[PDB]
Design a protein around this ligand. Structure first.
Ligand code: FES
Length: 99
């Protein structure tokens, strides 16, 4: 394993696909915001539905999330404020209305 790593995040947002590198120790939301992408949120603490997305491709660490149940994680749900990439990932954002 590397001392330092980042992963390519592809977000499929309502206004288009956007891509950026996300450090492996920065949450998806935080890294998107630093690149000027506006994503939904409210609690920023892993305990609500606001920042929900769907993982389409790759792997995440969501140890820091709590609101999604184990079946929802198995089904690909993501709380973007509380998720770290562990590989390159593609995530569809703005999926709250779907819960
Ligand atoms: S903004 Fe509440 S869980 Fe992410």
């Amino acid at each position: 394993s590397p001392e330092f790593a980042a992963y390519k995040v592809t977000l499929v947002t309502p206004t288009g696909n956007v891509e950026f590198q996300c450090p492996d120790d920065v949450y998806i939301l935080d890294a998107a915001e630093e690149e000027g992408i506006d994503l939904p949120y409210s609690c920023r603490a892993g305990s609500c539905s606001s920042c929900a997305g769907k993982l389409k491709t790759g792997s995440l660490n969501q140890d820091d999330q709590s609101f999604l149940d184990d079946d929802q994680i198995d089904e690909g749900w993501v709380l973007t404020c509380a998720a770290y990439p562990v590989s390159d990932v593609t995530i569809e954002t703005h999926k709250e209305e779907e819960l």
